[PDB]
Amino acid sequence: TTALVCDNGSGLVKAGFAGDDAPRAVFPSIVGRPRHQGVMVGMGQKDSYVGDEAQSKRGILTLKYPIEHGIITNWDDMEKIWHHTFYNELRVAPEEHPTLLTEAPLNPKANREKMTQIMFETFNVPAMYVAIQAVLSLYASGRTTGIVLDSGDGVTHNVPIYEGYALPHAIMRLDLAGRDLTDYLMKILTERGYSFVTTAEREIVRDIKEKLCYVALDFENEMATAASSSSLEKSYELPDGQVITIGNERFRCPETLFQPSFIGMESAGIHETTYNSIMKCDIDIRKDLYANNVMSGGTTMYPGIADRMQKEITALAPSTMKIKIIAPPERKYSVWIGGSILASLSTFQQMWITKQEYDEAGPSIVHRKCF
């Protein structure tokens, strides 16, 4: 017996066994359906596709995400994504194994209740737990003091933690994430005359975002520089062998994490939300929070984003303070890895919400015991 440890981002599913070095199945959390009247009688029929099958067929399909902004928003497809993960990706009977489920810090409280009820009624999981992402990043990064910044496909959030006391009022959620970087990237790409309209075409853009985009250390200097030369400009191939060529347009999307007005958010942007999360904390803690800043999640992977975060946060903090940024290349996994650690600790065995205890108490129990 070992605990399965599972993450549902908005963007991916990351899955394995507690005490693995790294996750064993990764795939997009995406469900496809055929847009069309299938022509050929005597072809096999697929009623839907889950995960990376749909990524293969994508040009034929409507692609929907069952999760956005870290919320489960249509359930009967999400249930399908889990059914795919347990039976097809990891090849385990889940009835034997306990499980961890992963969630953003403020999200609607019904989300926990349904996420419980599916596990216990549908599969008869032996026991379960639900854990805050920016907590598990501290386990992965080997620390018990820091301000985590964690940014998914769908949600971004700071959490300050100090010596293992999470600090609720400190905790501030943005809804900027790599998805809204992506949509904005499509809207800017229209400016250079390419229109990426459909869902799979959106994912084609998303690969551009993953490969070519980088964070301007100085925005204004490079925004002048791209007018000043070709040198920043770089080019990429569509799947059909069309070439597309991209200039300042490639860094300008990462910059929307620093000036959300480009997207039309009202709120501060991740540097200023980080500094305000520190300031909401007590003066004693603050010298140690400035000492540890942990980038987490996939959105942080952009080249140079750590050096931007340090440069911009420096101008807000008092001049004496040491401010230091921590950025392991693991970090995209680090929220799974922390769960891998956590489910193996023998102290944790007290924590599992058991099938008996739920069946007696009902899914309200997840609020009381889990957090």
Binding site: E68, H69, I71, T73, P108, D175
Partner: peptide, 7 residues
Amino acid sequence: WXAXCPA
């Protein structure tokens, strides 16, 4: 969500 946002 249910209010301030589409989910």
